[PDB]
Design a binder for this molecule. Sequence first.
Ligand SMILES: Cc1ccc2ccc([C@H](C)Oc3cn4c(c(O)c3=O)C(=O)N3CCOC[C@@H]3C4)cc2n1
Ligand SMILES: [Mg+2]
Ligand SMILES: [Mg+2]
Length: 270
Amino acid sequence: GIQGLAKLIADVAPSAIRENDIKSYFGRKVAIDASMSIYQFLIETTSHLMGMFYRTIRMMENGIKPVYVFDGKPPVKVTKQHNDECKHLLSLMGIPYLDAPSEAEASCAALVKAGKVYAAATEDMDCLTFGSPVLMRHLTASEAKKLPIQEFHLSRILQELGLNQEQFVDLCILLGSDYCESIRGIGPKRAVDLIQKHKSIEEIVRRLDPNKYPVPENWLHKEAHQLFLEPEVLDPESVELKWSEPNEEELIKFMCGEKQFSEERIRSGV
Ligand SMILES: Cc1ccc2ccc([C@H](C)Oc3cn4c(c(O)c3=O)C(=O)N3CCOC[C@@H]3C4)cc2n1
Ligand SMILES: [Mg+2]
Ligand SMILES: [Mg+2]
């Protein structure tokens, strides 16, 4: 995640965010961060299946064509069983899924950048740092929250901030990422100003007062910078997204027979 990034974009580049009704995404393909979704559904339980079933029905009823992306090896805990059960449900629902080689959000970004889908759906702001042109938030949110879809357009973030993607990555590192430490005492607005002036963490560090703003020791900022700009992602040319007919009888055998959900409920959803 990126600490304070959504708040910063709302304060300093508000035209990069649009709040939209779910009906406005008719006909669009979306790459869902399935790993972040199942985690949210979990926050033997069946809420990973309840969430995946109902939020997927919601997307399809609004004309959205979702593809679910699952995490691979890393560069409340979601288990192999949760992922396997969700994939089994997705297959019987006729919804496509992809296994990312590493972070799902980086591979959802790759699908958007390649033009395979319109947007990446995740609450994780790392998706923008990994370079997704469009990020949609609150797509899988409970109807109890009645949240609009919060869409971020990365090009307008870069445009309002007067930055390229390399500089934006260094800004996110200074904001506080999960790949390395940030510099203590430099807040979000000061980090924007420093990057706009000096462009890189390298040019900032050679200027900071070591008495005032020392940098972390064994700082992995170069490795973090490289992972965001060149992430390990799925090859979008190997992807052909297809959606098929849900298998109602098998969905009943799995959700009702094996997982004890209501038959009338599952049948009405199918
Ligand atoms: C509830 C909630 C809503 C939004 C949130 C945004 C960001 C974050 C933190 C700071 O960052 C991340 C957390 N996670 C993941 C990320 O990539 C990540 O960057 C992730 O992939 N998974 C895999 C499945 O297991 C859970 C993890 C969750 C936590 C959040 N928590
Ligand atoms: Mg992340
Ligand atoms: Mg993730």
